[PDB]
Motif scaffolding. Structure first.
Motif, PDB file in Angstrom:
ATOM      1  N   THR A  46     -16.240   2.368  -2.762  1.00  0.00           N
ATOM      2  CA  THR A  46     -17.081   1.804  -3.817  1.00  0.00           C
ATOM      3  C   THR A  46     -18.334   1.099  -3.298  1.00  0.00           C
ATOM      4  OG1 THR A  46     -15.159   1.504  -5.273  1.00  0.00           O
ATOM      5  CG2 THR A  46     -17.157   0.273  -5.817  1.00  0.00           C
ATOM      6  N   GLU A 104     -18.388   6.270 -10.229  1.00  0.00           N
ATOM      7  CA  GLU A 104     -17.038   6.045 -10.724  1.00  0.00           C
ATOM      8  C   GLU A 104     -17.029   4.938 -11.768  1.00  0.00           C
ATOM      9  OE1 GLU A 104     -15.719   3.114  -6.982  1.00  0.00           O
ATOM     10  OE2 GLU A 104     -14.562   4.914  -7.476  1.00  0.00           O
ATOM     11  N   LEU A 107     -18.050   6.705 -17.987  1.00  0.00           N
ATOM     12  CA  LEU A 107     -17.427   7.840 -18.656  1.00  0.00           C
ATOM     13  C   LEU A 107     -18.425   8.927 -19.052  1.00  0.00           C
ATOM     14  CD1 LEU A 107     -16.346   4.874 -20.020  1.00  0.00           C
ATOM     15  CD2 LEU A 107     -14.436   6.401 -20.522  1.00  0.00           C
TER      16      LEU A 107
ATOM     17  N   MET C  75     -11.186  -2.394  -7.136  1.00  0.00           N
ATOM     18  CA  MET C  75     -11.481  -2.804  -8.503  1.00  0.00           C
ATOM     19  C   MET C  75     -11.515  -1.635  -9.484  1.00  0.00           C
ATOM     20  SD  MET C  75     -14.492  -5.360  -9.805  1.00  0.00           S
ATOM     21  CE  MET C  75     -13.903  -6.567  -8.618  1.00  0.00           C
ATOM     22  N   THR C  76     -11.830  -0.473  -8.970  1.00  0.00           N
ATOM     23  CA  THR C  76     -12.005   0.696  -9.777  1.00  0.00           C
ATOM     24  C   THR C  76     -10.675   1.322 -10.131  1.00  0.00           C
ATOM     25  OG1 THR C  76     -12.981   1.191  -7.664  1.00  0.00           O
ATOM     26  CG2 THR C  76     -14.198   1.696  -9.560  1.00  0.00           C
ATOM     27  N   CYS C  82       4.830   0.277  -9.630  1.00  0.00           N
ATOM     28  CA  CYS C  82       5.190   1.173  -8.538  1.00  0.00           C
ATOM     29  C   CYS C  82       6.066   2.306  -9.066  1.00  0.00           C
ATOM     30  CB  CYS C  82       5.917   0.407  -7.428  1.00  0.00           C
ATOM     31  SG  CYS C  82       7.622  -0.038  -7.813  1.00  0.00           S
ATOM     32  N   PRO C  83       6.011   3.477  -8.408  1.00  0.00           N
ATOM     33  CA  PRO C  83       6.780   4.656  -8.819  1.00  0.00           C
ATOM     34  C   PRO C  83       8.278   4.382  -8.960  1.00  0.00           C
ATOM     35  CG  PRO C  83       5.200   5.267  -7.150  1.00  0.00           C
ATOM     36  CD  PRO C  83       5.131   3.769  -7.261  1.00  0.00           C
ATOM     37  N   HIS C  84       8.796   3.409  -8.215  1.00  0.00           N
ATOM     38  CA  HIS C  84      10.206   3.044  -8.303  1.00  0.00           C
ATOM     39  C   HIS C  84      10.536   2.293  -9.591  1.00  0.00           C
ATOM     40  CE1 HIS C  84      14.130   1.391  -7.491  1.00  0.00           C
ATOM     41  NE2 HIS C  84      13.646   0.161  -7.489  1.00  0.00           N
ATOM     42  N   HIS C  85       9.777   1.237  -9.865  1.00  0.00           N
ATOM     43  CA  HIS C  85      10.022   0.404 -11.037  1.00  0.00           C
ATOM     44  C   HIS C  85       9.672   1.116 -12.336  1.00  0.00           C
ATOM     45  CE1 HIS C  85      10.198  -3.084  -8.176  1.00  0.00           C
ATOM     46  NE2 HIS C  85      11.154  -3.419  -9.021  1.00  0.00           N
ATOM     47  N   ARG C  87      10.677   4.146 -13.105  1.00  0.00           N
ATOM     48  CA  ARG C  87      11.787   4.992 -13.536  1.00  0.00           C
ATOM     49  C   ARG C  87      13.138   4.287 -13.624  1.00  0.00           C
ATOM     50  NH1 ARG C  87      12.140  10.454 -10.472  1.00  0.00           N
ATOM     51  NH2 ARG C  87      12.680   9.061  -8.727  1.00  0.00           N
ATOM     52  N   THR C 117     -10.423   4.854 -20.791  1.00  0.00           N
ATOM     53  CA  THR C 117     -10.386   3.977 -19.639  1.00  0.00           C
ATOM     54  C   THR C 117      -9.121   4.173 -18.788  1.00  0.00           C
ATOM     55  OG1 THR C 117     -11.300   1.831 -18.987  1.00  0.00           O
ATOM     56  CG2 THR C 117      -9.330   1.811 -20.377  1.00  0.00           C
ATOM     57  N   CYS C 148       4.770  -4.625  -4.028  1.00  0.00           N
ATOM     58  CA  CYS C 148       5.456  -3.371  -4.334  1.00  0.00           C
ATOM     59  C   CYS C 148       4.768  -2.152  -3.727  1.00  0.00           C
ATOM     60  CB  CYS C 148       5.607  -3.186  -5.848  1.00  0.00           C
ATOM     61  SG  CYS C 148       7.015  -4.051  -6.583  1.00  0.00           S
ATOM     62  N   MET C 149       5.503  -1.445  -2.872  1.00  0.00           N
ATOM     63  CA  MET C 149       5.001  -0.242  -2.224  1.00  0.00           C
ATOM     64  C   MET C 149       4.757   0.869  -3.238  1.00  0.00           C
ATOM     65  SD  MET C 149       6.976   2.124   0.568  1.00  0.00           S
ATOM     66  CE  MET C 149       8.448   1.924  -0.433  1.00  0.00           C
ATOM     67  N   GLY C 150       3.535   1.395  -3.248  1.00  0.00           N
ATOM     68  CA  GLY C 150       3.162   2.436  -4.187  1.00  0.00           C
ATOM     69  C   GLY C 150       2.558   1.859  -5.454  1.00  0.00           C
TER      70      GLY C 150
ATOM     71  N   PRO D  84      11.092   7.076  -4.348  1.00  0.00           N
ATOM     72  CA  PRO D  84      10.159   7.603  -5.352  1.00  0.00           C
ATOM     73  C   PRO D  84       8.697   7.583  -4.894  1.00  0.00           C
ATOM     74  CG  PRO D  84      11.749   6.172  -6.399  1.00  0.00           C
ATOM     75  CD  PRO D  84      11.994   6.059  -4.919  1.00  0.00           C
ATOM     76  N   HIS D  85       8.354   6.678  -3.982  1.00  0.00           N
ATOM     77  CA  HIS D  85       6.996   6.590  -3.463  1.00  0.00           C
ATOM     78  C   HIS D  85       6.686   7.722  -2.488  1.00  0.00           C
ATOM     79  CE1 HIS D  85       3.380   5.234  -1.504  1.00  0.00           C
ATOM     80  NE2 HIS D  85       4.018   5.072  -0.357  1.00  0.00           N
ATOM     81  N   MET D 150      12.282   0.823  -0.490  1.00  0.00           N
ATOM     82  CA  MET D 150      12.683   0.433  -1.835  1.00  0.00           C
ATOM     83  C   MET D 150      12.763   1.644  -2.753  1.00  0.00           C
ATOM     84  SD  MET D 150      10.579  -1.922  -4.531  1.00  0.00           S
ATOM     85  CE  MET D 150       9.130  -0.961  -4.097  1.00  0.00           C
ATOM     86  N   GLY D 151      13.926   1.838  -3.364  1.00  0.00           N
ATOM     87  CA  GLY D 151      14.145   2.967  -4.246  1.00  0.00           C
ATOM     88  C   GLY D 151      14.769   4.141  -3.517  1.00  0.00           C
TER      89      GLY D 151
END
Ligand SMILES: [Zn+2]
Ligand SMILES: [Zn+2]
Ligand SMILES: [Zn+2]
Ligand SMILES: [Zn+2]
Lengths: 197, 197, 197, 198
Positions: A46, A104, A107, C75-76, C82-85, C87, C117, C148-150, D84-85, D150-151
């Motif tokens: 950015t 970025e 829109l 910021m963008t 996270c992908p875990h939380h 599902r 947005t 949280c990873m991801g 999952p990540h 995690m996961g």
DNA sequence: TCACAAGTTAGAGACAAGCCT
DNA sequence: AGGCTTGTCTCTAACTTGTGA
């Protein structure tokens, strides 16, 4: 082919450019050097560019960003992306692959492939500063390192920000040099401290 | 992409590879490291490779040269030219743009790929040493630096030279490592002095 | 994704944010640092946020909460779970699984996906302070640790509380940094005592 | 849940044994094996050399399967798969499905399998005799998730079960070892050893 | 033959930070 | 909850490596 003017012209609306003070921390993704009027930034990251005006332009006003080679020897050549990054498949779904400069967040961005001059340009409709703001910020991306073999090829470039009415007439124009590298903080510090020679 | 064998095999004709002693000079264009079995050479510069045999193979015998990535995680990728270099139009009039390995001087040369493994290879019909000579020399060119962005990408490769009959059956095989860099003399000297462990 | 302004703007109504003094006693669930303007809180636990205003807004006025990454580099990017939380069976029946911020009780709560947005936000119809109280308190939940990873991936975020007319116009906004961690009391005490360096 | 494969060491009719490289607990190593713990400490996605020792060369068409199971009893019946990540970021091997934890480098006749009943993930390569002068066959394994993911494995220790099978899938030989996938193998191994004695 | 240009990588301890003695 | 677990930072630097006095 034909070289667009780079002469700073604030026009009837006092069109100035603003930037963030980010410092040469060697861990920064984008920084601006007031002395060099040059923005050092990482690839595809950015680049916040501020738009300062004394008076709000009419609606339908758009802003245009175009890249041109700084050296006179290379001015006639169109600024494009290296053959690699062009076939890299990283499109945001809006920007053409060959285009160097992207926007970025916005829109209703448009990307131009000029019929005559063959030059690449990107536009967004101007928006007045949110109530209580002092300026409108645009996030730009640069989709190739300045040293990319097959495009800019270590040749420094300039980004020309142009304020246009709906027709396409000039209202205001400002410019700044751009170096797209891996380490903006390092290269800005080095280049600034080399200006003493 | 199935990996071609790299085990040396001199076969029924005692097929050996010969190289010139050039020394790690400062302005050398091509230099072979016996300790590393590695050839350091500049981009598109001549790489002399000698062919030694104990007994002259039957006529219609062909000599193939193929490049594969040395590292296990990259072996299954086809070795091509970077997107930039395959569009620079430096073609000798014979070689297709995307082939990495060329043969200069030889007019009876063929540029091939494989139906299944999709790998690039360059072949020339084997010609016996002209009376007086004890070997035949082939001049290879490597059309991309090893560090080429989008191409080999800093990944070291091996060149596999195979002796084949007209049918394509194996008769002999040898190989060597290749670094295509700007400074062969410097990089060879560096790697050899790094082997001291 | 248009970048929502972090321009703190009290507007015509004097819209201000308040918090509870809970102290950094290890084993607190949720605490606020006035100096850092930062809320340290546990995952999925109650986060009391009270709204202070000089004059009672017209009915149909709503309060919107939105997350955003503090750093300019990120910021963008939209703030998601996270992908875990995403599902795991967490949903209160009201809140979408993807959403980070949700509101406890308040059956007239609404969660939007912002087709254009793509930014997550949660809204409540504004209700005047109950008689005796001088402010309206909202109970927020944060459905992912800051580390949280991801997800947020150790990147600090800001929560943007906006005061809106029913149509969605800006009346006033404020913001505060959020760290979602296991030990709010510890991490606040640490971060505050590190500012002295 | 999912049934549990046996872990009992069984050399069988061909004397199937496992071998490892002596790497030492360096402070910059990517993969090391602890003989005292029968445990391999390794970084994510890095190469893990595993040797295969046999007394008598087995019939042609015999295969080698690698499968991960949780060590602790309360977790053994759960299937071991990527978090999952890591499941959603291309790590592509060119071969391996994204969800598989254990991969095999170099071998092109590799197969990534999924059991009809136990639903467990397993990776299989055809057994190839030692290219002498090797006295054993070496396989390069990858682990595509940290043990603390995690996961995923979620800080639960695991066992890798190497089974020697015929074409049909009948057992011929089986060995096993514990696996910790961490950022610092050398540190974590040195710690756990200096904790086991005594 | 060096010095420079400009992208990629590495050391181990000092921390960040979630979890369980 | 204190202790520990476990991945990351700090990030210059040193290392690539092609280009230039
Ligand atoms: Zn590029
Ligand atoms: Zn190239
Ligand atoms: Zn989460
Ligand atoms: Zn994982």
């Amino acid at each position: 082919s034909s070289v667009p003017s780079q002469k700073t012209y604030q026009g009837s609306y006092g069109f100035r450019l603003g930037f963030l003070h980010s410092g040469t921390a060697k861990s920064v993704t984008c920084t601006y050097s007031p002395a060099l009027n040059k923005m050092f930034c990482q690839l595809a990251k950015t680049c916040p560019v501020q738009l300062w005006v004394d008076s709000t332009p009419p609606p339908g006003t758009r802003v245009r960003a175009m890249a041109i080679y700084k050296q006179s020897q290379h001015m006639t050549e169109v600024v494009r992306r290296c053959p690699h990054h062009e076939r890299c498949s990283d499109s945001d779904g809006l920007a053409p692959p060959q285009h160097l400069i992207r926007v970025e967040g916005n829109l209703r961005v448009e990307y131009l492939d000029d019929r005559n001059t063959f030059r690449h340009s990107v536009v967004v409709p101007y928006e007045p500063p949110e109530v209580g703001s002092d300026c409108t910020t645009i996030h730009y991306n640069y989709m190739c390192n300045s040293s990319c073999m097959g495009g800019m090829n270590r040749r420094p470039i300039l980004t020309i920000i142009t304020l246009e009415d709906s027709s396409g007439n000039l209202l205001g124009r400002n410019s700044f040099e751009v170096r797209v590298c891996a380490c903006p903080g390092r290269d800005r510090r080095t280049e600034e401290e080399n200006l003493r020679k």
